[PDB]
């Protein structure tokens, strides 16, 4: 039996419904999300890390000059400096005063920490969304399965079939380009490979962590040795990766709206409340019992003993009850006014049971079903206290929730007075226009 | 930190993040006298009550002014026939309702 | 210099231009596009093939009755047939009369032909588009290169930067559901995982070619082994692959519009002649030449010697040129009215050379530029007398092509006659409106 609904995309709180086949005892199902993951399809543009500017040992020729040549290396620089006259230990080294030239070449390469820490540039697409759902229905205990949230893919949870999706909103926390570092992601607009800007984020761009090719724009100037000593002095823009680490933005793990943590291994966006999901569940026919075997309840009345519109289950009500036979019966309130904590209630012959609920209305007028029979419970709630609370709201607020049946009375008397004066003026015009336009002749 | 009904997640140092939710528990009495009513709803919904009050004073003003205009119009259209014709009898019902001076 | 243009996304037609950076000779550019590879990103949803029903050996327990569990197997049946007297050779195989057990286990699994043939079902996305292109400029010979069709990709063709901007139209032959079979694809919706309709397509649905889970759904039923012969008679719907082959639709490649052929191993539609392409080609500056070096050409006179508006270049014409000095010229018409067969003409003095061209207008008016000069020539063309031929259309037809310059005369004189008659009326109304009203006065 196929039953369709819409459930809010809110992870913790269960979603209770009563699927009802006429002629069978209505069986009570519960759908609880425990993961909802927005998994984008990504590809690795490149990775970046601190660089190391290795300097080969310079070649110094006496009484004669070498020349510079170019080798296929990232940010390779050669500069032959003249008249060096080096002074090593154990005497001067190069005989000829002047006509002494040092090659002094450098080049840039991935540091030995790239393999450990390295930002990864990713370009993301719409991707897919999937979730872990926990199902209960009738006597069948909780059974969990992973489902794809799209309108088509079903999932055989136990013996029921479940189709979840699409999300009502296609929102995803990730922009086109993202960068993952450590365990946090950033919505950075990283330079397209091969356009690095010498020290802001792209200064080392290796397609993969172990790619021989490498792009490097560290602005490696090569200064001359001075004072007759042997070394290769270079000036260089500091690591763009270091600058990025210092001036790193707030991570998306801390800035994402709707409150979803970012996990890493598939790059999920986990458990954020955007919109709602349709539910289409096919309950097995074998889980439906005939009506005759299940209690039928009549002569009902419900009296809300206590109720405070707190986030938790701050409402206790009792129901006067007469039945056809003893047994266990499900309970549910279809409307969004109140959510019932109890699912089923044992029922004697001509007893009176109690149930708990959470509501957001000052005046919770809601309808409650007990085995195909509805009762209206009115109550009058009272303000909670203690302000900040650690657990989420178990109910959904509506615009007409806080009106407290005197404020209703006030807007009633106001609109009534306003309309009454207006209509009185209208009837005044009628009577004057009647006695005068006509009825003077 | 202004914590709304939608909740607030705060992380302090290396402590694990903590989520807090602000249940709609304000000052003011939803029932009873008008002043307590308006203060309870102002603490609940500040902007909504301000615009709602402004709208309500606006609608009562325009209705009251239009009503009094209609009424005074009818008053004129009642008296003027008799005003203009001083020598007739002004029917007592009209005399008291479209309240009238007795002319000569 | 950078030259930008747009071009028909046609497969054999060359696209001819002249880059003109001032103070230099015009230089002749040719682009030829040799395949159009529209590569859609796809995900394999599930594969399918003929089923095969393995019926393990029945359990014949003689006196008494066993029961069998639901072991997890695709479309598994197990039903105990009570009252069996299995009567083999050399004795009946059981010593009881009645109260004997025939367990009738049946079980369905992927056939071995699935290894070699399988109608694998994908889900098409937007993907990327790329093409193999062939350039010719100046005196440089042909230079070919594959290119991603998106503005953001240098794609250096030789020594020039070629940027091919995103294809004007985003049409793709493939809908979101496609099923690949053998050497062809089908634009068919596929009842996806676990929605198998039990007998048309999705009788078997295996997540990959070698997957341990298999959503068989084949409506296997088991019957009583007749008359005490040991066997497991099973009745069930024939294979969905059978009926899908018999009632297979027309393959997409036989239905794909815009002459779109399909290849398989990237699942790409080639030669797809929809819409147009922008082009931005940054040519080397060295291939240019100073105008002051270039020959002067003057007193140009071109005469069409015979034309007939065929697809192939069915017009021959002659240009009498007079010259400054030996040298090369490019000749192309800057307007679509003609396409010139000859890329370059390398030319001596004081002479009269012939060029072939193709056109569909019945009085072409090409303005053809020889060596940064101009000459306009026109004349009648006649119907080329073949009906259907196999050469595609070299020229592009425009609406003002077929009018035979008497019909042009006819519509001109007609429209003039209407306009002038109305004007004569307007003049008559004005002149009577004044001569006869205001002057009599
Ligand atoms: C489903 O819910 C039950 C009860 O709340 C719990 O024991 C079980 O662990 C849940 N499933 C998962 C996958 O967490
Ligand atoms: C480029 O065009 C020329 C024209 O003759 C052709 O020979 C050549 O094969 C084309 N390039 C490629 C890669 O086919």
Numbering used by the authors:
A (entry chain D), C (entry chain A): 1 to 441
B (entry chain E): 316 to 419
Paper text:
To determine the structure of VLDLRLBD-Fc-bound to EEEV VLPs, we used the block-based approach, which involves subparticle extraction, and focused our analysis on the quasi-threefold (q3) spikes. The global resolution of q3 spikes focused on this receptor-bound cleft was 3.5 Å. For model building and interpretation, based on our mapping studies of EEEV–VLDLR LA repeat interactions, we used the VLDLR LA1 sequence. However the cryo-EM density we observed likely reflected a mixture of different LA repeats. The cryo-EM structure revealed that VLDLR LA repeats bind clefts formed by adjacent E2–E1 protomers on EEEV. In the structure of the complex, two basic residues in EEEV E2, K156 and R157, make the most prominent contacts with VLDLR. Both are found in the central arch of the E2 β-ribbon connector, an E2 subregion that folds from two polypeptide segments that interrupt the connections between E2 domains A and B, and B and C. The aliphatic portion of the EEEV E2 K156 side chain makes hydrophobic contacts with LA1 W50, and the E2 K156 side chain ε-amino group interacts with the side chains of LA1 D53 and D57. E2 R157 interacts with the side chain of LA1 D55 and, nearby, the H155 side chain interacts with the LA1 D57 side chain. The adjacent spike protein protomer (E2’–E1’) seems to make minimal contacts with the face of the LA repeat that contains the short β-hairpin and is less conserved, and these interactions only involve backbone atoms on the receptor.
Alphavirus spike proteins comprise trimers of heterodimers of glycoproteins E2 and E1 that mediate binding to cellular receptors and fusion of virus and host cell membranes during entry. We recently identified very-low density lipoprotein receptor (VLDLR) and apolipoprotein E receptor 2 (ApoER2) as cellular receptors for EEEV and a distantly related alphavirus, Semliki Forest virus (SFV). Here, we use single-particle cryo-electron microscopy (cryo-EM) to determine structures of the EEEV and SFV spike glycoproteins bound to the VLDLR ligand-binding domain and found that EEEV and SFV interact with the same cellular receptor through divergent binding modes.
